[PDB]
């Protein structure tokens, strides 16, 4: 690929693993990042959604638009990458 | 190798290798070098099918 910035490269290395991301509406999604994009659209699988009141539900697949993601907690091994 | 890999139920992929032999040794032009590569792929698919 073209030289996209290091945070986007680390996001694609995060595809193997579990990531936890919060959306601008406040819901926290934990799941296994199956595809990511350079606009940081995220596809999660085996997802658990946690609502802002602390309720939770399972979701088989979730697509989140990249500009609606606030942050992602990435796994630690990516610090080595 | 292909046949035994199928029987194992491996997943089979092809890599055509020492392509340089076409230009340097055989000196096939560009067009005939494509046909030689095409025939190799056909041979393997003939085994697979």
């Amino acid at each position: 690929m073209t030289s996209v910035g290091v945070p986007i490269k680390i996001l694609h290395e995060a595809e193997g693993h579990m990531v936890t991301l919060e959306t601008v509406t406040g819901e926290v999604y934990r799941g296994k990042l199956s595809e990511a994009e350079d606009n940081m659209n995220c596809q999660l699988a085996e997802t658990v959604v946690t609502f802002r009141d602390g309720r939770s539900h399972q979701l088989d697949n979730v697509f989140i638009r990249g500009n609606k993601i606030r942050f992602m907690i990435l796994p630690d091994m990516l610090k080595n990458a | 190798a292909i046949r035994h890999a199928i029987q194992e139920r491996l997943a089979v992929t092809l890599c055509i290798s020492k392509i340089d032999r076409l230009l340097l040794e055989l000196k096939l032009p560009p067009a005939d070098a494509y046909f030689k590569l095409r025939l190799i792929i056909d041979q393997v698919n003939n085994i697979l099918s």
Binding site: - | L26, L28, D32, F35, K36, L39
Partner: protein, 327 residues
């Protein structure tokens, strides 16, 4: 070992890596297999040492592909009633009333020989026959591994069983009496069926163009090999030849070919067929002397006699004792 280069490398590691001692190496040799080429012209009976039981078997030569299928495990004996019956009719358009009978392969569960029960059910009940069945199968398996001409494995023989004399004895008769008796039955069945040796064969792939084709045919003709492929290898100046050659003759072949070609050719060898050694192992008119060439009929007899001598057996076959006086 596979062929030539495997045994060189194995023996290199033996000398250099692992053993580091003064080993003597015999000249290389193939294991043979023993096969029938006819249906047994008699049904051959064997009576147990106690005379209370009688077994009768005939040997037949196996359906031509089926030993590859068994040794590959395209068919497996655990599939016995439904799936094994279906396999034999669908592939072979076959015996299927008798294919349901089969219940055993020998000399092991992947061995290239089959035992059938062909007793018509009026003669003995299936429970009594089921009691002896496990005993007879061990007898048939023993006979196919060790037994006949030169004590090489039997291959490509189908045995049929058809006898009923079984008595009130079951503990005493079942182990001791029946199982040695089933082996003599299989031998006498096998020995009536006109027996032959099989040797194993290589397939060869060779690449060099104008002069080397003629050299390939020459070197094969010296070593009983025969050719059938003549390919003008597409987009290459080489021709590709393929040939069958018998492993017992192959040992020089790679070095002979590269010398006579001057390295222009190279050949690799792979194995897949068993084929029948020319001649008759039992022909007493052939006398073998090691100082001289022993070409077409003598080949089977030499291979048997020298194999017996190597094993250390008696020089000529038991067959008068295995048929015995009654048969």
């Amino acid at each position: 070992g596979t062929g030539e280069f495997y045994m060189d490398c194995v023996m290199h590691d033996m000398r250099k890596v692992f053993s580091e001692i003064d080993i003597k190496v015999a000249d290389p040799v193939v294991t043979f297999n023993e096969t029938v080429i006819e249906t047994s012209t008699l049904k051959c009976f064997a009576e147990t040492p106690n005379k209370k039981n009688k077994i009768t078997m005939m040997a037949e030569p196996l359906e031509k592909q089926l030993d590859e299928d068994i040794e590959n495990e395209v068919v497996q004996i655990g599939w016995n009633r439904r799936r094994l019956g279906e396999f034999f009719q669908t592939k072979y358009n076959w015996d299927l009333l008798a294919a349901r009978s089969i219940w055993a392969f020998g000399p092991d569960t992947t061995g290239p020989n089959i035992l059938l029960d062909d007793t018509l059910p009026s003669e003995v009940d299936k429970h009594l026959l089921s009691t002896v069945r496990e005993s007879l199968v061990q007898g048939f398996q023993w006979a196919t591994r060790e037994g006949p001409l030169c004590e090489e494995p039997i291959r490509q023989v189908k045995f049929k069983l058809l006898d009923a004399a079984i008595a009130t004895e079951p503990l005493y008769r079942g182990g001791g009496q029946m199982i040695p008796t089933a082996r003599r039955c299989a031998y006498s069945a096998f020995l009536m069926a006109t027996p032959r040796l099989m040797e194993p064969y290589y397939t060869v792939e060779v690449v060099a163009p104008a002069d080397c084709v003629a050299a390939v045919y020459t070197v094969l003709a010296k070593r009983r090999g025969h050719v059938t492929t003549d390919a003008p290898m597409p987009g290459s100046p080489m021709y590709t030849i393929s040939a069958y050659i018998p492993v017992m003759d192959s040992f020089g072949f790679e070095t002979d070919l590269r010398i006579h070609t001057q390295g222009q050719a190279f050949c690799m060898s792979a194995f897949h067929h068993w084929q029948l050694v020319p001649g008759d192992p039992l022909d007493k008119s052939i006398v073998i002397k090691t100082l001289d060439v022993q070409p077409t009929p003598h080949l089977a007899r030499e291979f048997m006699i020298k194999t017996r001598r190597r094993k250390g057996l008696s020089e000529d076959v038991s067959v008068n004792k295995f048929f015995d006086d009654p048969m």
